Amino acid sequence: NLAPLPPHVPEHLVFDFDMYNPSNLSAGVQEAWAVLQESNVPDLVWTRCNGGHWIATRGQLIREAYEDYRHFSSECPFIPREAGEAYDFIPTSMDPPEQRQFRALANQVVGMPVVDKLENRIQELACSLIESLRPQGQCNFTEDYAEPFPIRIFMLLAGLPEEDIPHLKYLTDQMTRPDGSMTFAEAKEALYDYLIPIIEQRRQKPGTDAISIVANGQVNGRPITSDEAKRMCGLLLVGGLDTVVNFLSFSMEFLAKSPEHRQELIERPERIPAACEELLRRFSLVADGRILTSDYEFHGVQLKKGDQILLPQMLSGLDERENACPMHVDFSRQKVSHTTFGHGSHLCLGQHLARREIIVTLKEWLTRIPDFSIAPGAQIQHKSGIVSGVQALPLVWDPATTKAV
Numbered sequence: 001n002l003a004p005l006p007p008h009v010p011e012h013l014v015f016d017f018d019m020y021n022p023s024n025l026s027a028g029v030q031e032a033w034a035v036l037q038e039s040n041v042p043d044l045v046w047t048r049c050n051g052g053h054w055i056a057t058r059g060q061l062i063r064e065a066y067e068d069y070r071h072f073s074s075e076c077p078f079i080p081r082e083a084g085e086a087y088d089f090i091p092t093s094m095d096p097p098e099q100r101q102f103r104a105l106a107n108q109v110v111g112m113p114v115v116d117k118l119e120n121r122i123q124e125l126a127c128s129l130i131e132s133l134r135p136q137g138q139c140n141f142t143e144d145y146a147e148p149f150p151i152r153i154f155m156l157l158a159g160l161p162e163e164d165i166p167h168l169k170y171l172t173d174q175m176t177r178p179d180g181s182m183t184f185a186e187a188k189e190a191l192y193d194y195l196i197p198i199i200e201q202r203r204q205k206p207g208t209d210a211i212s213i214v215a216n217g218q219v220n221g222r223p224i225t226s227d228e229a230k231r232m233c234g235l236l237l238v239g240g241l242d243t244v245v246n247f248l249s250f251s252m253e254f255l256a257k258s259p260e261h262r263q264e265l266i267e268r269p270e271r272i273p274a275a276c277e278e279l280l281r282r283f284s285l286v287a288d289g290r291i292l293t294s295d296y297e298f299h300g301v302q303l304k305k306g307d308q309i310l311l312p313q314m315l316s317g318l319d320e321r322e323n324a325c326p327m328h329v330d331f332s333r334q335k336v337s338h339t340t341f342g343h344g345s346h347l348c349l350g351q352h353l354a355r356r357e358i359i360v361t362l363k364e365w366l367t368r369i370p371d372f373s374i375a376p377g378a379q380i381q382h383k384s385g386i387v388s389g390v391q392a393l394p395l396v397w398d399p400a401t402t403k404a405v
């Protein structure tokens, strides 16, 4: 339903966008969010949905607000308010200065040096999964690849059993795209219920997995607390299980629908890194935000202490003011402007792992299955939330057009 309009919000700024079920969803989720960038829509609107909150609709404002942590705090970064209040992951629920010390520790477990120790295993799993599908001439891409590839890599990194994936993936999804059965607070507590014993165990008997490294880590030279380690590990799980997983499906849906972009990357494989970046712009998928720390006039709009503002990372790169013909995918685009991995002091720490997983997927899939399509008569349905995704992606191909490496 629609929350009562706060006294300070004028009627002319009301645009009742629902980030968990946007009205234009059938057009594609990016398309659905892009309604906020039609010419008649102001740069900053109020929606009465999901408890009531601001939405910045343009890259300029989104970037400004992410830079200004003084006014726009990460203490309550999710909508609805109950979710943002319960949200206590580290480093994301902290502002500078206290946030910064935790980034280095997170870098030890998901940063570039670790991508290096994983490189071969990433490559091997992608190739194995794709070769298994190749002779079938069909797959359900979400369940058959988009989930198991990044998730099994994360579970390896974290030293967690693969049989725990269904439970962990369910919990993670309630924090980003709740089905209604659990509040954010309940999902978070369930995730902590999982992690607590494991963190204890690995502080007693450290291994070399990511949970052990975090749980025994130092932050600016002093020991991390069990509490802090839990709040960091919860965030790593969510990043591992619900980011790349969704992004791969948007990318593969696009490639299934655009043979000439497939051919471009097959003919000119050196373009794959650039293609990855353009796809990250076009199929950007995250939208969280901030809470006002004080009353503040921003771009001529009165904001009040405690107001939440959604700052959709998704939207900056889709803004025509940042990229011309923004819904068009051009792998040769010269300045690919986006905030897909965030902006300001909270820039994604998992982005190198993410790019590796994306690039390996594009190369190893097109190597083996260059020619594929959406299944006959399928209409691909998206889903929206803090991280958006694809409900199902049935693909088909003729095995005769494939190549076993």
Ligand code: HEM
Residues within 6 Å of the ligand: 074, 077, 090, 091, 092, 093, 099, 103, 106, 110, 154, 235, 236, 239, 240, 243, 244, 247, 285, 286, 288, 289, 313, 339, 340, 341, 342, 343, 345, 346, 347, 348, 349, 350, 351, 353, 354
């Ligand atoms: C396509 C893949 C991904 C996208 C689009 C993405 C997006 C983002 C965004 C937008 C933020 C900033 C949120 C904010 O400012 O409130 C962020 C932060 C973060 N991400 Fe990523 N992410 C991805 C993959 C990953 C992965 C795979 C991991 C770990 C396995 C990860 C770990 C983190 C962490 C730890 C932060 C917190 C940084 C901080 O708060 O200081 N992300 N990500």
Ligand SMILES: CC1(C)[C@@H]2CC[C@@]1(C)C(=O)C2
Residues within 6 Å of the ligand: 089, 092, 176, 235, 238, 239, 243, 286, 287, 288, 386, 387
């Ligand atoms: C917004 C995010 C993508 C970023 C990493 C996981 C996520 C859901 C967060 O809670 C912070």
Ligand SMILES: [K+]
Residues within 6 Å of the ligand: 075, 076, 077, 084, 085, 086, 087, 088, 093
């Ligand atoms: K909070």
